[PDB]
Design a protein around this ligand. Structure first.
Ligand SMILES: OC[C@H]1O[C@@H](O[C@H]2[C@@H](O)[C@H](O)[C@@H](CO)O[C@@H]2O)[C@@H](O)[C@@H](O)[C@@H]1O
Ligand SMILES: OC[C@H]1O[C@@H](O[C@H]2[C@@H](O)[C@H](O)[C@@H](CO)O[C@@H]2O)[C@@H](O)[C@@H](O)[C@@H]1O
Lengths: 347, 347
């Protein structure tokens, strides 16, 4: 059922391949990159998760303090008030915490396989209360007016969506939190429709709902409204627990092709396909019954919870969709897909 | 600690005082009314919860189907897949449902104590997928351009916020779902600030957050953004479980006075006070340590879970704040408060 062609060099990047960005921290995970072209080079906007060296029987992680300087929180694994069932997000006396801090980092490549840092292009770190626990999973939308970044803003009070804009990838303009908690997986459409901007997003309901893919429209790109539920999870299927959009949708004659991701209760992530109407993106035309890509490879099965494929960035060259994705929330990888082949399955 | 003066006629309205709006349904609850003045009369925009006559050993409730016609869902009380611990919201095989369906209903009054229906002013029922489980808790904002309604839109996929507009309360314009799930308690500001519209709202986070009061800004009132966390819950306090805004804030010399509501883990709701900066409503100036109103009265303690005070509508006449509120999610009530007295406590 997997119709994906991995690059033979996978994994491309690993934690040990790069030097740490935060002082006195190791790199734990490289995952979930945004993808775009600039200066001829192919660029990756990596999510880089860092934390201190872990001592035996102690969970330690960085957080910004009141002064705004990074500090190390520590909890004992055998503490009764600690809940560390999920290694990504932990609880302690009600309040929640991340076990790492993420930031966005640029890497360029001529060939599109060997990536390295570029002098003069420093990383993007979290700023303000709402980005106190870091920023994650950035989608890059290449448009006429420039590059728009839509990413997760994490803090003790919210998992929400922020947006930035850049032309040269050196100066940045921050539009703030565009969608409130609990929301992520924001894929901005790369062109306007009926003189309006559109984006997918993925709010999470404690009750009376779930983790479904939603649509929103905007005139100025800062303010959003007229929300509509696009596609939900499916009981019994591979995408029963949660669904979410990846990168921006691809413009085709059939409709808007969207490579979304879905997972089950074992936290096994796969990729699927959504086809949507051109005039009304909220209306679904076709949807893949089975996943178009699964965590088959060995490096896609080296997780600490489940087997994870996650894409939030891709390039399109006619029929060939070049996707970059995180494998087991640890390493960066590359693969290729066929538009025609996907559309064929959706008939 | 209660600084509130109840009307002696409380309760004003009860389920049995009105005739049912939906066919073959009883009125279960009258609660949480919006308040405004029109045609000299004082108007209440009641939330009216209805369901069939309950048979022994069966929970039955109405929902709109795809066509938009009423249907009766039924569950057996002794079913192992049923969870009816909470009588308001139930679960069945993962999916959640309400035990009643709410709609909005207009009642006028000369004196402001005896309320009755007005011919030519029919009720507002839910329309579309997102209002399939009904609409609830409407705040009415009286503005220069007319009356703006902000209410909860409930369905199987979302608890969200919709907005409508009216001049005569006969014609209506629907702006759709302005804020995505899981969100409610939307209090639109009755005037602009720095040529921008502002509203409180209350998103709910499954993790990494809670039930806090938030702020959002808008240019056109349909699209919202630049979200900011205003005030959270307080561990140990009466408002440890959840907080939420009521009606629109009152313009004073000190700042924006907001009569918010808060509850504990026993689901005991009280009312408090927030004072906010005029230029920056997100910045809190003062907040009441103890509640300004509590469920003291007998009719405020006839619940089926806890003691509930809930306001989402009020009138202001100089110093006197006339609030209308739901008691035990069953009956409508009235009370009076002093601006000066509240401001005095916040010093
Ligand atoms: O772990 C798979 C998948 O999970 C989601 O994010 C997790 C984690 O990375 C994130 O820090 C927290 C808080 O936002 O949420 C989840 O635990 C995805 O959004 C993606 O990041 C990740 O690959
Ligand atoms: O019951 C107290 C208080 O709770 C909140 O609403 C509940 C219920 O009335 C509502 O139908 C569902 C779905 O929105 O949510 C809550 O269970 C308040 O918003 C208010 O309506 C109610 O008085």
């Amino acid at each position: 059922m997997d119709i994906a062609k991995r690059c033979e060099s996978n994994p491309l990047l690993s934690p040990k391949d790069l030097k740490a960005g935060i002082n006195d921290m190791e790199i734990t995970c490289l995952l979930n990159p945004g993808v775009f072209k600039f200066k001829g080079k192919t660029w990756l906007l990596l999510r880089v998760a860092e934390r201190p060296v872990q001592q035996e029987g102690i969970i330690s992680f960085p957080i910004y303090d009141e002064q705004g300087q990074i500090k190390v929180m520590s909890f004992a694994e055998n503490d009764p008030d600690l809940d560390a069932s999920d290694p990504r997000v932990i609880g302690y006396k009600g309040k929640n915490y991340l076990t790492t801090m993420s930031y966005l980092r640029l890497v360029s490549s001529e060939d599109g396989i060997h990536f390295h840092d570029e002098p003069g292009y420093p990383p993007i770190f979290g700023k303000g209360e709402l980005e106190a626990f870091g920023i994650e999973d950035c989608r890059v939308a290449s448009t006429k007016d420039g590059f728009y970044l839509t990413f997760t803003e994490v803090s003790s009070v919210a998992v929400g969506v922020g947006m930035m804009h850049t032309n040269d990838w050196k100066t940045f303009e921050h539009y703030g939190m565009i969608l409130p908690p609990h929301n992520k997986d924001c894929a901005l459409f790369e062109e306007k429709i009926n003189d309006k901007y559109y984006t997918f997003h993925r709010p999470s309901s404690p009750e009376l709902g779930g983790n479904y893919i939603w649509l929103a429209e905007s005139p100025d790109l800062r303010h959003w409204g007229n929300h509509k539920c696009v596609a939900t999870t499916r009981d019994g299927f591979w995408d029963c627990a949660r669904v979410g959009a990846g990168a921006a949708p691809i413009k085709t004659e059939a409709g808007w092709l969207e490579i979304y991701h879905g997972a089950d209760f074992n936290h096994r992530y796969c990729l699927g396909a959504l086809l949507l109407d051109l005039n009304d993106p909220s209306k679904v035309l076709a949807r893949s019954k089975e996943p178009i890509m699964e965590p088959i490879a060995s490096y896609e099965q080296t997780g600490f919870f489940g087997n994870v494929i996650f894409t939030n960035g891709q390039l399109v060259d006619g029929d060939t969709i070049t996707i970059y994705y995180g494998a087991s929330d640890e390493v960066i990888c590359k693969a290729e897909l066929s538009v025609k082949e996907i559309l064929n399955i959706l008939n």
